[PDB]
Design an enzyme around this catalytic site. Structure first.
Site, PDB file in Angstrom:
ATOM      1  N   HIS A  61     -41.069  26.121  17.104  1.00  9.82           N
ATOM      2  CA  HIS A  61     -42.085  26.752  17.956  1.00  9.82           C
ATOM      3  C   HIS A  61     -43.498  26.524  17.434  1.00  9.82           C
ATOM      4  CE1 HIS A  61     -38.612  28.801  19.750  1.00  9.82           C
ATOM      5  NE2 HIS A  61     -38.305  29.321  18.542  1.00  9.82           N
ATOM      6  N   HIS A  91     -49.635  31.023  10.950  1.00  8.47           N
ATOM      7  CA  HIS A  91     -49.311  29.953  11.816  1.00  8.47           C
ATOM      8  C   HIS A  91     -50.364  29.861  12.911  1.00  8.47           C
ATOM      9  CE1 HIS A  91     -47.820  33.585  13.788  1.00  8.47           C
ATOM     10  NE2 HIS A  91     -48.197  32.976  14.923  1.00  8.47           N
ATOM     11  N   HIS A  93     -51.292  28.619  17.226  1.00  8.51           N
ATOM     12  CA  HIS A  93     -50.934  28.305  18.595  1.00  8.51           C
ATOM     13  C   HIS A  93     -52.020  27.331  19.096  1.00  8.51           C
ATOM     14  CE1 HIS A  93     -48.134  31.800  18.759  1.00  8.51           C
ATOM     15  NE2 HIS A  93     -48.982  32.246  17.813  1.00  8.51           N
ATOM     16  N   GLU A 103     -54.186  32.215  22.430  1.00 11.39           N
ATOM     17  CA  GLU A 103     -53.396  33.290  23.092  1.00 11.39           C
ATOM     18  C   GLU A 103     -54.335  34.363  23.576  1.00 11.39           C
ATOM     19  OE1 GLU A 103     -50.018  34.075  20.337  1.00 11.39           O
ATOM     20  OE2 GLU A 103     -49.074  32.877  21.897  1.00 11.39           O
ATOM     21  N   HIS A 116     -53.020  32.860  13.343  1.00 10.81           N
ATOM     22  CA  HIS A 116     -52.497  34.187  13.109  1.00 10.81           C
ATOM     23  C   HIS A 116     -52.056  34.295  11.639  1.00 10.81           C
ATOM     24  CE1 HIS A 116     -51.437  34.602  17.585  1.00 10.81           C
ATOM     25  NE2 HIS A 116     -52.691  34.871  17.369  1.00 10.81           N
ATOM     26  N   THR A 195     -46.290  37.954  19.812  1.00 12.37           N
ATOM     27  CA  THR A 195     -46.520  37.110  20.967  1.00 12.37           C
ATOM     28  C   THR A 195     -45.438  36.154  21.227  1.00 12.37           C
ATOM     29  OG1 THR A 195     -47.783  35.380  19.866  1.00 12.37           O
ATOM     30  CG2 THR A 195     -49.047  37.252  20.735  1.00 12.37           C
ATOM     31  N   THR A 196     -44.358  36.200  20.428  1.00 11.78           N
ATOM     32  CA  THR A 196     -43.163  35.451  20.662  1.00 11.78           C
ATOM     33  C   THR A 196     -42.008  36.441  20.662  1.00 11.78           C
ATOM     34  OG1 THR A 196     -42.693  35.005  18.318  1.00 11.78           O
ATOM     35  CG2 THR A 196     -43.955  33.392  19.515  1.00 11.78           C
TER      36      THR A 196
HETATM   37  N1  LIG Z   1     -47.715  35.154  17.030  1.00 13.83           N
HETATM   38  S1  LIG Z   1     -47.516  36.581  16.234  1.00 13.83           S
HETATM   39  O1  LIG Z   1     -47.505  37.679  17.108  1.00 13.83           O
HETATM   40  O2  LIG Z   1     -48.379  36.563  15.135  1.00 13.83           O
HETATM   41  C1  LIG Z   1     -45.882  36.487  15.540  1.00 13.83           C
HETATM   42  C2  LIG Z   1     -44.639  36.381  16.359  1.00 13.83           C
HETATM   43  C3  LIG Z   1     -43.577  36.378  15.481  1.00 13.83           C
HETATM   44  C4  LIG Z   1     -43.891  36.814  14.208  1.00 13.83           C
HETATM   45  S2  LIG Z   1     -42.721  36.911  12.940  1.00 13.83           S
HETATM   46  C5  LIG Z   1     -41.250  36.885  14.124  1.00 13.83           C
HETATM   47  C6  LIG Z   1     -40.087  37.684  13.675  1.00 13.83           C
HETATM   48  C7  LIG Z   1     -39.898  38.973  14.072  1.00 13.83           C
HETATM   49  C8  LIG Z   1     -38.870  39.714  13.616  1.00 13.83           C
HETATM   50  C9  LIG Z   1     -38.196  39.203  12.508  1.00 13.83           C
HETATM   51 CL1  LIG Z   1     -37.066  40.527  12.111  1.00 13.83          CL
HETATM   52  C10 LIG Z   1     -38.405  37.941  11.869  1.00 13.83           C
HETATM   53  C11 LIG Z   1     -39.441  37.126  12.432  1.00 13.83           C
HETATM   54  S3  LIG Z   1     -45.567  37.008  14.037  1.00 13.83           S
HETATM   55 ZN   LIG Z   2     -48.829  33.851  16.555  1.00 14.37          ZN
END
Ligand SMILES: NS(=O)(=O)c1ccc(SCc2ccc(Cl)cc2)s1
Ligand SMILES: [Zn+2]
EC number: 4.2.1.1
Length: 257
Positions: A61, A91, A93, A103, A116, A195-196
Site C-alpha cells: 500500500h 509513511h 501517500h 489525503e 504521516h 486513513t486505511t
Molecule cells: N495513514 S494513517 O492514518 O497514518 C495510518 C493507517 C494505518 C496505520 S498503522 C495500521 C494498523 C492498524 C492496526 C494495527 Cl493493530 C496494525 C497496523 S497509520
Molecule cells: Zn497515512
C-alpha cells in the site's frame, strides 16, 4: 483484499470495515476560514534527537520507515495532546500526477503528497492496544509540494529501488526524521481515524500548515514503486490516498492566528 484500484479502493472499504461511514473518519478538508484559533493549544514538542530507524518495508500500500519504539526515544508531546506518544513509523501517500496525492486538503487544495509520522500513546503500552482507544494515536501530517529538493528525503528515495515490490524490506538505520520537517510547527488539529483499513477512530490528527518542498525527481521515484509482489503484473504504486470524508460533528482547531 482492500487497496486503491477501481475494484478495491476507498469506495469499497465500507463493505468489510463498516466504520468507514463512521462519525470521526479521516482525512478531511481543512476549511481554513472555519478552523478556530485556539489560544489554549500548546506548541508542539517534537523530540526526535534519539530516534532509531530500523527498516523500510513495502507493505503493498505504501512504504513504512520503522523505528525502534521499545523505549521513549522519539516522542511527540504537547500541542493538543495529554501525555507522551512514541514514534513507530512514517509513511507517505502520493499521486500519479503532482496535482493530487494528499489525503487532507486545505480549502479543497490537494498537495502532491502527504507524510504521516505515526505515534502511539505510551499509557496503553503497545500499538495494538492503543489503536483500540479514542486517544490512542497521534499522527503528524505534513504536506509535500513539488519544487526544490528536500535534502533529508534523498536517503529514503535512494533505497526505494531495493523495495520495489510488496513484501520487500531493507535495513534502514540511522535515518533522522528531523530532516523531513518544515521550518514552522504551526498546525491544525481534529479528532479522526486511520486513513486505511481498519479505519479505527483512534487518532488525534496534527496537520502542519507549512508544506515541505520535494523535487519532481524525488516524487517520480515514489511513483516507480509497485503495489504488486515480485513477478506479478506491474501496478505502479500511485494514488494511494483516501479522499476527504464528512466532517460531521467535529471542530478543526488552529494553533496560529
Ligand atoms: N495513514 S494513517 O492514518 O497514518 C495510518 C493507517 C494505518 C496505520 S498503522 C495500521 C494498523 C492498524 C492496526 C494495527 Cl493493530 C496494525 C497496523 S497509520
Ligand atoms: Zn497515512
Amino acid at each position: 483484499h482492500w487497496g486503491y484500484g477501481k475494484h478495491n479502493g476507498p469506495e469499497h472499504w465500507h463493505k468489510d470495515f463498516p466504520i468507514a461511514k463512521g462519525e470521526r473518519q479521516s482525512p478531511v478538508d481543512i476549511d481554513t476560514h472555519t478552523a478556530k484559533y485556539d489560544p489554549s493549544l500548546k506548541p508542539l514538542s517534537v523530540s526526535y534527537d534519539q530516534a532509531t530507524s530500523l527498516r523500510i518495508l513495502n507493505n503493498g500500500h505504501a512504504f513504512n520507515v520503522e523505528f525502534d519504539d521499545s523505549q521513549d526515544k522519539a516522542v511527540l508531546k504537547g500541542g493538543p495532546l495529554d501525555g507522551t506518544y512514541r514514534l513507530i513509523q512514517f509513511h507517505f501517500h502520493w499521486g500519479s500526477l503532482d496535482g493530487q496525492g494528499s489525503e487532507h486538503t486545505v480549502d479543497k487544495k490537494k498537495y502532491a503528497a502527504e507524510l504521516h509520522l505515526v505515534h502511539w500513546n505510551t499509557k496503553y503500552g503497545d500499538f495494538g492496544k492503543a489503536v483500540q482507544q479514542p486517544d490512542g494515536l497521534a499522527v503528524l501530517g505534513i504536506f509535500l509540494k513539488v519544487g526544490s529538493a528536500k535534502p533529508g528525503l534523498q536517503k529514503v528515495v535512494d533505497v526505494l529501488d531495493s523495495i520495489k515490490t510488496k513484501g520487500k524490506s531493507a535495513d534502514f538505520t540511522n535515518f533522522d526524521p528531523r530532516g523531513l520537517l518544515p521550518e514552522s510547527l504551526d498546525y491544525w488539529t481534529y479528532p479522526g481515524s486511520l486513513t486505511t483499513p481498519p479505519l479505527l477512530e483512534c487518532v488525534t490528527w496534527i496537520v502542519l500548515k507549512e508544506p515541505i518542498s520535494v523535487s519532481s525527481e524525488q516524487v517520480l521515484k515514489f511513483r516507480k514503486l509497485n503495489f504488486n509482489g515480485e513477478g506479478e503484473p506491474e501496478e505502479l504504486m500511485v494514488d494511494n490516498w483516501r479522499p476527504a470524508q464528512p466532517l460531521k460533528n467535529r471542530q478543526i482547531k488552529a494553533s496560529f492566528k
